[PDB]
């Protein structure tokens, strides 16, 4: 029963439901999942298991429940993110030109320029097209990446 913490950044619940859906399929895959907002584990990234990070973007900025996390992530880097084996899923809309998936991307790559155990490559959802396709692709690939990594 490995520890799967799922954090979300959400203003209108798309990312939050996706997060809770993941935690629901984890339970089915024997994990010990935990769901919470992003900027509530700001600094408290799990040094064991893995942490799925599901977040939206708002005009290039983090959702209201994710701002503390990212800021902590941006400037603060001292309290390194070593040990933290994560993965990032992006909720975005192509209708937002130059800012497409900017927050998930920021978090993903920033987390790595601080000591990443990126076990599964980021995943993106375009609300303007086939968000469940991509969410589905990233998910199946995802479980396996973490599967092989640890246990089965």
């Amino acid at each position: 029963n490995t520890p799967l913490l799922v954090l979300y950044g959400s203003n209108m619940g798309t990312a939050e439901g996706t997060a809770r859906d993941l935690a629901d399929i984890a339970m089915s895959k024997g994990f010990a999942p935990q769901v919470a907002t992003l900027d509530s584990h700001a600094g408290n990234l799990p040094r064991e298991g893995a942490v799925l990070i599901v977040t939206a973007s708002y005009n290039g900025h983090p959702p209201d429940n994710a701002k503390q996390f990212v800021d902590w992530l941006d400037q603060a880097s001292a309290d390194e993110v070593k040990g933290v084996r994560y993965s990032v899923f992006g909720c975005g809309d192509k209708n937002w030109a130059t800012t497409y998936q900017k927050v998930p991307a920021f978090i993903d790559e920033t987390l790595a320029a601080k000591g990443a155990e990126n076990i599964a490559d980021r995943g993106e959802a375009d609300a303007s097209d086939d968000f469940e396709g991509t969410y589905e692709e990233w998910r199946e690939h995802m479980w396996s990446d973490v599967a092989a990594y640890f246990n089965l």
Partner: protein, 439 residues
């Protein structure tokens, strides 16, 4: 301060006093917000939380601690919210879709079967549609509203208990002996609601729920935080809650939408042309409903002008300041007037009172907190995707299959209850004679 149309009265006042004004009762202070900037501030969840208005507290007598009539800090709000949220996603709508079409087909067929000299009662037929739709998709139960003059006994009791709860709000003297029959009728309606829904839940647990609907998810769902599922009683209160949160809100949307279309015939023509291009099979598929882009714009623009749950309440979690100018004490009430927000000229332009679907052609063009027909934050409407899926589907089918006539030149009259409706809106439908599934 009496009137049967408070929100409308309050918009008028907002036009005089601006973005904020306050009414005071012996022990109550209420501030009403109308501007995007103040409402934006009030929707900061770390500063403000959902308040239960008196109306909501009256409905709690039968809706219990379901999501709609619960305080955020309640155990069962947290549990239910955590467990149901994924079942209300846009993707989840793909498996509700077939049963939505089922009831949509019944609506279309009813209008096809009308004789030439009769007409359509719009909010009445949209309500039958939405009540049956929520029952079938939600817990595989058919109220068969289109097969009766008198609604299913559950529906009769729900509509009556909600009307009773609204009425209590204007009762000068609740304990007058004339309210005695009301009080016992109220308990009877509660008992018919509880009994039917309880029985359905029990039959399903026994049945082993070989379905995949909301009731399935609620019986099988596990709250991660506490590890426990919802109990049978709360589950019943959630089912009662979906019908009451969702029947006249969605009802009203489709009715205001049709109102603006027949008042704006060139807009109608443009939506009808898109419904005709996109809906090419006897019955709509999920993918085709998602292609009804202009229909969608029509629906957002009717929700801009007359959002059918037009106000929501908030309380200050701690003493604070608003707009850097207005001191609030812990527990002070803020009421958001959504139709006013939707008319903020600094956001929408000067033409706010005009029906113009084209406003929503560019989503990135609309700032955050400018448009909130479904409320705010974790307490926003969990049914938002269900309702917009149902309305886009049904409005698309209506426009594909009929031409409409404002045969009485209807004068808009907005009745206020928990919701808004174009009271007495009637039309005449003329069939284009296109079969829905075949001849």
């Amino acid at each position: 301060l009496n009137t049967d149309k408070p929100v409308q009265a309050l918009m008028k006042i907002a036009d005089e006093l601006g973005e904020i004004f306050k009414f005071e009762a012996p022990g109550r202070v209420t501030r009403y917000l109308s501007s995007q900037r103040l409402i934006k501030e009030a929707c900061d969840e770390s500063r403000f939380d959902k308040n239960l208005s008196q109306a909501l507290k009256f409905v709690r007598d039968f809706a219990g601690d379901g999501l709609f009539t619960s305080w955020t800090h309640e155990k069962n709000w947290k549990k239910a919210h955590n467990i149901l949220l994924p079942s209300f996603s846009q993707q989840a709508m793909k498996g509700y879709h077939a049963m939505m079409v089922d009831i949509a087909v019944q609506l279309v067929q009813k209008w096809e079967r009308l004789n030439a000299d009769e007409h359509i009662e719009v909010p009445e037929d949209m309500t039958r549609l939405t009540l049956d739709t929520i029952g079938l998709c939600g817990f595989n139960y058919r109220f068969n509203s289109f097969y009766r003059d008198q609604p299913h006994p559950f529906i009769t009791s729900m509509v009556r208990a909600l009307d009773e709860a609204m009425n209590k709000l204007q009762r000068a003297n609740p304990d007058d002996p004339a309210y005695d029959e009301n009080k016992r009728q109220f308990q009877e309606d509660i008992k018919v609601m509880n009994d039917l829904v309880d029985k359905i839940i029990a039959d399903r647990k026994a049945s082993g729920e070989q379905s995949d609907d909301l009731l399935t998810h609620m019986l099988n769902g596990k709250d991660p935080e506490t590890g426990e599922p919802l109990d049978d009683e709360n589950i019943r209160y959630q089912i009662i809650t979906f019908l009451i949160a969702g029947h006249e809100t969605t009802s009203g949307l489709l009715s205001f939408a049709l109102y603006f279309l027949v008042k704006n015939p060139h807009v109608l023509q443009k939506a009808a042309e898109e419904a005709a291009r996109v809906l090419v099979d006897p019955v709509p598929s999920y993918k085709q409903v998602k292609q009804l882009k202009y229909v969608g714009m029509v629906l957002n623009e009717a929700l801009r002008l007359w959002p059918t749950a037009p106000a929501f309440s908030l309380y200050a979690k701690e003493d604070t300041v608003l707009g850097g100018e207005y001191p609030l004490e812990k527990g002070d009430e803020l009421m958001v007037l959504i139709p006013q927000l939707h008319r903020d000229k600094t956001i929408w332009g000067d033409d706010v009172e005009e029906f113009r679907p084209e406003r929503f052609e560019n989503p990135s063009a609309i700032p955050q907190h400018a448009f909130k027909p479904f409320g705010n934050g974790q307490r926003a409407c969990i049914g938002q995707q269900f309702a917009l899926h149902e309305a886009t589907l049904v409005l698309g089918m209506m426009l594909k299959h009929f031409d409409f006539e404002d045969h009485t030149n209807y004068e808009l009259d907005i009745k206020e209850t928990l919701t808004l409706k174009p009271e007495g809106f009637v039309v005449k439908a003329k069939s284009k004679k296109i079969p829905l599934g075949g001849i």
